[PDB]
From a paper:
More recently, [name] and its homologs were identified as narrowly tuned fructose receptors, and they were also found to be expressed in the brain and function as a sensor for the hemolymph fructose levels, thereby regulating the feeding behaviors. Among different sugars tested, e.g., 100 mM maltose, arabinose, glucose, trehalose, and fructose, only fructose activated DmoGr43a, with a measured EC50 of 42.97 ± 4.69 mM and ~30 mM in electrophysiology and calcium imaging respectively. Lined by S7 that spans both ICD (S7a) and TMD (S7b), a continuous ion conduction pathway in the 4-fold symmetry axis runs all the way through both DmoGr43a and DmGr64a, and are all in the non-conductive state. In both proteins, two patches of constrictions are formed along the ion conduction pathway, one near the extracellular entrance (Ile 418 and Phe 422 for DmoGr43a, and Val 438 and Gln 441 for DmGr64a) and the other in the anchor domain in ICD (Leu 386 for DmoGr43a, and Glu 399 and Phe 403 for DmGr64a). Intriguingly, the narrowest point at the extracellular entrance is formed by completely different sets of residues in DmoGr43a and DmGr64a, e.g., bulky, hydrophobic phenylalanine in DmoGr43a vs smaller, hydrophilic glutamine in DmGr64a. Notably, Arg 70 from the S1–S2 loop, which is disordered in the apo state, becomes well-resolved in the fructose-bound state, and travels downward for fructose binding. When the apo and sugar-bound structures of DmoGr43a and DmGr64a were aligned, notable conformational changes could be revealed, mainly tilting of TM helices responsible for sugar binding towards bound sugars.
Numbering used by the authors:
A (entry chain C), B (entry chain D), C (entry chain B), D (entry chain A): 1 to 161, 166 to 216, 263 to 424
Write the structure that this text describes.
């Protein structure tokens, strides 16, 4: 993942949420270096293990209690256990990916520094820092308000329907796991959006340099080809770093969307208190936004990477210089055999098409379920 | 979208249906220009908002009425609300796409003028105008008769089963929204069919120029390559202009097809009045024709664009001139890395394959639903 | 479709089954020519219309009879009507494709003659004639015995459970339509297998000419490239000729497989007479064999066409002659941008993958249906 | 399949499990040769036929017994018969593939020897032998303990719920068929992993030779291209050898996963003895491990084969030698048109994506089934 000064605070968040057991330090001549932090690695492992144990322990006491409010019937038990276990699995996979991703992180950061060295005019450090910090703050604030509203509505329903603080305490670890999941989403989205921005800047450089002395252009094209290859390598590195984590995040999004939609439709049919309906609608919106935060950056990066070949062809059709058109032909040959789609550890390609697939499931699972009640 | 004299009347229809908030005016030396029309933009926004509010208000009064004829039971309420809301969503998305699509429209029209300047022998202005006007008139006439028949059968059923004009008045806005949807279909089909026709004309020029003095052919091949690239850019521009609108139109087609088929099968099982059966069959035919009007032009354009590479290869195998065969090799290289499939904002590729997918859903959703009644 | 002497009898069968309204006649200097036969065209149209009317009339009298044996309950009526109508639709589509496919047939036959002129050593006229006639005879014999067994078991069940010859007479037209469908399958399989055989012969020529004086090889490679392009054009011509017919044939295969499997499982659960079980098993085998007869030739042709590029690359790596390696490079360039997959009028690609898709449906439709009985 | 000294013992296992009716013998000057073993071929055919007959006979006596413990109800009969028949089908297909795969085996082994002759520095004979023998021993030990545990829990349940040794004897042949299936998995995994290892070694050679006198490098690149083509041919040979067997193995994995998950959920709902729950969980883990053992090697080989083009491009961008860059261009041209994905006899491509598809089924089949109980 990306560790840059412009979004250094992001890294700190990832370090505080048991997802970045690393330490970043400038050396003498610039050059931030990322090394393993044994203290923070131990802290992250212990925190993840303790929190998973705590949430499962709370679930087990809720099931083995003389008055349950969320376990209750067998189907409710199964749904709640599946949801909690899916979140737990996503959290554990993210912590594991951050645990053994030191070498990939250093390689990606070195490649990103090398790439950003060339694209000096298009840096926009202030704008990128502002956007990244705004995204992180917005996501954290939204998840905080949503967790507060959920706990408030749950305590309200348990109070109207008397020994509820114990259940709330048992269920707090689930909410902290949701916080960690939000942090994981923030980290992955930041890295993928950085890759997409660098691809867009490369395309803009290629467009400006030729649509709007020959040796400067020759090594410019050479550096552009090198940067495109390095960006492809960075995409592959991010895939290796976060593939299984993103796969389990997508599984979590699908499961939560289906379960929340089914519960919302059932509650609307039963015509119960509207506050739970608003809470469920907010949860649906949050899950859809999570799915978008995962899918959109990968699709944007893949689309921006594939456009470079058209600009290269247009450049080729507007060159009367032989060594530089030879370099352009080499660039076109390199781009023809190239991929930049983020792969969830090979199981699927992460782009907007995933959304369609999810719909094709979310509808089907609903059609079997929604009308089975009646 | 396309704004040309040959189908200028089409644009007027799109302007009258709150879908084209633009003004087209010739300047001095030919050259139609498209500019933003503030009056018509405000009119379109106000009309869309007022009509959506009116149809939802009619639905809400129908639900909160002492005698409902379309809301009634909970499942009927859900089906009717989903259908109306889907049409509303498609209408709103189309109006939004036309609202903020000024720059794309001007770019597409300038590119189309540049392309059509080269293909002077193959213009067929009278034929294209006749076909476009016939398509628009046929679609409007069909939707008018269908809406009249639907309102007639609904008023007949409500009269035989007494205070019905109020419900008809409440439901008129739904029919006007259907009119706007038909206009949106007409506009998109016109643009996509124009792109397909231009691709076919380019292919015919390439076939005729070589299957049936060398510098004329050299710049002819250069202009053909430029026109093919510009047509690809126009396809991408149309995708950017109408992607989300086409996606929601496809969702509308699928939902309406499934709902109408289910209702028709249920009515046939109940063996009720046959007039409603004929009305439902007409609605099914109309929805299928809408789906075809969306899918067929995109598939035709994609197929016609992909054929150019075969003609280019055949030309390459029949050339003994070195600079022009070099140009032909450049054309082949450009065509090899090229796409022209219309994408519904990246979620799916719009071609005839979509039909198959729809069947794979329409059957499944029916199998779960049709036999669940018995 | 293919009209050659080696399988001329096949054409006669297609002429007798209202599928080939053409007349083939040698001219003076060899050169069979295919022309429109007005008498046979009128005969085919009248026979198809009369037979469709007869089968639907028999179905309608069976439904409106005081004792039905196949209509009976509403679900049985729906299943029988859907099956009969699907067969009718496939028959009508095949007759329509043969009705307006004169120009495609002549073009395909001329291209096939031109191709076969080059591949003189690999002709095997006796072997191809024997195989084609054996396939046609086997298919006709199998369908005859299956229809006889089905009518025998139906008359036996109606006799044990008395005025049955009337129902048998009403249902005979369905069996004649099955005969026409078998003829359509034979025709399509013959054409596709001929295309695949020609592709294989081209590949064998390419392998033998180089793995086992230079101008002979140069024009040999030129003729091989021309023949490959012509074979691709022939595949596209067959697609244009039989796309919608093959699509409806595949729909028929899927529907019949699902319905027969469901009926067989229901009968086995009810533990009724075993003779109907054997008849249903034979029908399942026949439907699977029909699906294979449609899918396998297209997949074989597509696989054999795609292999040529590997042989061309191997030839390129073993050539020290400059004009002929230039020709080989042109051949490789032509093969790189090329497709030969049979497309069912653009809706789907016909290959073995279709089988998988069918399973993914046949299982699902069964899971919803088989366990719904219990 | 692969017959090498490093894993010669593996072959012996495949010979003892009626899957490798061959005999491997060194000739005078090295060069192991594989010939048909008539004695072992007859033994394999007889053993497979006798074992299939024995397991079906045991099933039939269990069904026609005055006290059944696994047939019982109709749905239990159907599930057990389908599972046993699926295992039988996989076993028969594997034995048939090994029966008529002599020529493919010799061709693959000769090609593998030719390839391994070039990659002399990267041999790791001890490591490969250790890994292969460890994999075989681990798989056999796991299946042995699982079969023992299953028979123990079945005899325990039948004893607590008395004439059980007869049923255990009737069901032993099913367990021996499971042993044969495990052997088939071991053989296929060994061959595919060998292909993947050779691809990885080729990539490592290409990386080392250039990232870290010119004629040596020229014939080195030539030999690398030859080895890559031969590895592709070996992948195609393995596909031809084991396609239908792998397809039926995948069908077996899907069916067993779905059935075991459904039975486990039903048992957990019924809250019966936990020992059967642990046994079912172990069976689920084993089926998932089988599916991984089939899918992972093919995906790894396909991924390692596709990476060579990037290394070739990087080499091309770092060469100032004209004949060798010409050879590199030829290598790039060969790699551009090339595939190495294992195909299950054309029906599907075997990679990690299959897993996703399986989930998309396993969920759906469960959603229809799991909640239908309640």
């Amino acid at each position: 993942m990306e560790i840059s000064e412009t979004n250094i605070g992001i890294f700190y968040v990832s370090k505080l949420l048991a997802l970045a057991p690393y330490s970043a330090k400038k050396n003498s001549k610039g050059q931030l270096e990322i090394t393993r932090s044994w203290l923070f690695s131990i802290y992250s492992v212990c925190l993840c293990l303790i929190m998973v144990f705590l949430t499962y322990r709370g679930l087990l006491f809720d099931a083995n209690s003389n008055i349950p409010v969320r376990m209750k019937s067998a189907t409710s038990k199964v749904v709640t256990a599946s949801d909690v276990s899916v979140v737990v699995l996503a959290i554990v996979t993210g912590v594991y990916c951050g645990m053994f991703g030191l070498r990939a992180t250093q390689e990606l950061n070195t490649r990103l520094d090398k790439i950003d060295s060339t694209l000096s005019p298009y840096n926009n450090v202030k704008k990128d820092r502002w956007r990244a910090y705004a995204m992180a703050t917005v996501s954290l604030i939204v998840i905080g308000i949503l967790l507060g509203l959920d706990v408030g509505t749950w305590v309200r329903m348990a109070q109207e329907m008397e020994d509820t603080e114990l259940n709330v305490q048992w269920y707090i670890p689930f909410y902290s796991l949701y916080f960690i999941l939000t942090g994981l989403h923030i980290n992955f989205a930041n890295t993928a959006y950085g890759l997409g921005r660098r691809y867009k800047r490369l395309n803009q450089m290629l467009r400006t340099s030729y649509l709007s002395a020959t040796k400067n252009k020759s090594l410019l094209i050479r550096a552009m080809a090198d940067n495109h290859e390095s960006l492809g390598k960075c995409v592959r590195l991010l895939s290796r770093f976060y593939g299984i984590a993103v796969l389990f995040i997508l599984v979590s999004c699908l499961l939560h969307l289906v379960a929340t939609a089914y519960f919302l439709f059932l509650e609307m049919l039963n015509k119960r208190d509207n506050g739970y309906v608003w809470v469920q609608m907010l949860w649906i919106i949050f899950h859809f936004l999570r799915l978008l935060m995962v899918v959109e950056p990968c699709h944007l990066a893949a689309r921006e990477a594939r456009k470079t070949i058209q600009i290269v062809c247009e450049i080729e059709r507007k060159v009367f210089e032989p060594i530089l058109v030879e370099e352009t032909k080499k660039f076109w040959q390199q781009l023809l055999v190239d991929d930049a789609e983020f792969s969830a550890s090979g199981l699927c390609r992460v782009n907007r098409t995933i959304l369609t697939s999810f719909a094709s499931a979310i509808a089907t699972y609903l059609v079997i379920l929604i009308q089975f009640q009646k």
